[PDB]
């Protein structure tokens, strides 16, 4: 459109040993991918820089939770990590971290499963989740905004064209976003706890603050 669900499918269709430490490991490995994916999103490689940065620091993690959760739509009571591993929820309920895990399954994965979310919305979600102008510091405020509005517009268009027998779908995509919010939060809350206290294979990139 003015932001196209396909120049956007690209970014998606382009950047394709105890359970305790294995996960954050895999997300380190994801961090460079998430470098790559936000590269090819329309009008994006314009204006500023530090804030094309500040943005991927702001929710590297919600982007990254959606990637693997969607990816675990074909798995039962567990996830497929970046590396390919499989933290089935019993390894995560033993590893202390079972609860924030339960929510990932039933609140994201299962809800993505149930409605059958597809891959182009995944990247319009993660592209509004990215175009978050409530991040501190910007040349223009309506930068990450008027362009995030473009995503709304196109995302809405795609949904109606692709799924005409579901007029309620656009709002669901957007309503999958909060429960991710609260799950980005306490995912984060967790990482800090496994962090400047000790004991876990922390990786160089994950580290890049937290």
């Amino acid at each position: 459109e003015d932001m196209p669900v396909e120049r956007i499918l690209e970014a998606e269709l382009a950047v394709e040993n105890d359970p305790v430490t294995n996960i954050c490991q895999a997300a380190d490995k994801q961090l460079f991918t998430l470098v790559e994916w936000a590269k090819r999103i329309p009008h994006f490689s314009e204006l500023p820089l530090d804030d094309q940065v500040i943005l991927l620091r702001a929710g590297w993690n919600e982007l990254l939770i959606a990637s693997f959760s969607h990816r675990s739509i074909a798995v039962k009571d567990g996830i497929l990590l970046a590396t390919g591993l499989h933290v089935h929820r019993n390894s995560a309920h033993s590893a202390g971290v079972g609860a924030i895990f339960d929510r990932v399954l039933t609140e994201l994965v299962s809800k993505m499963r149930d409605m059958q979310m597809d891959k182009t919305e995944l990247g319009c979600l993660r592209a509004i989740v990215l175009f978050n102008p409530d991040s501190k510091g910007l040349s223009n405020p309506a930068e990450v905004e008027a362009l995030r509005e473009k995503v709304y517009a196109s995302l809405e268009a795609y949904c109606k064209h692709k799924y005409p027998e579901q007029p309620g779908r656009f709002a669901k995509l957007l309503l999958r976003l909060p429960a991710l919010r609260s799950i980005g939060l306490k995912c984060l809350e967790h990482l800090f706890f496994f962090k400047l206290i000790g004991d876990t294979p922390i990786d160089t990139f994950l580290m890049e603050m937290l």
Partner: peptide, 11 residues
């Protein structure tokens, strides 16, 4: 890992 994201971006 420490700054380094302006070429990791703007090559």
């Amino acid at each position: 890992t420490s700054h380094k994201l302006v070429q990791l971006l703007t090559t």
